[PDB]
Design a protein around this ligand. Sequence first.
Ligand SMILES: *[C@@H]1O[C@H](CO)[C@@H](O[C@H]2O[C@H](CO)[C@@H](O)[C@H](O)[C@H]2NC(C)=O)[C@H](O)[C@H]1NC(C)=O
Lengths: 32, 49
Amino acid sequence: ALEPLVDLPIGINITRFQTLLALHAAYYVGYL
Amino acid sequence: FELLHAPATVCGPKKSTNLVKNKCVNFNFNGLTGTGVLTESNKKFLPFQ
Ligand SMILES: *[C@@H]1O[C@H](CO)[C@@H](O[C@H]2O[C@H](CO)[C@@H](O)[C@H](O)[C@H]2NC(C)=O)[C@H](O)[C@H]1NC(C)=O
């Protein structure tokens, strides 16, 4: 169960995203 | 105006009283007008509620 962290009233009309990786593990993506 | 059960951040200039407990009172919390006995409770609200 996931509690909220943040809400942004920032008005973006989004359609796309990506992650960011740190360098000089795995990740999973699903939809609502 | 946003009306929600989430924490308020804009309020009218109503002066806050002290809190009175174990006694029947006519309360108002952030515009939440009601009437009842306010008392300390073991309901552990999550930090966002
Ligand atoms: C939100 O932004 C998108 C572009 O990022 C707008 O365009 C999309 O929706 C239109 C609906 O009429 C389509 O005509 C476009 O082809 C479509 N474009 C893409 C790339 O998906 C969209 O209109 C915006 N939302 C509103 C309510 O206008």
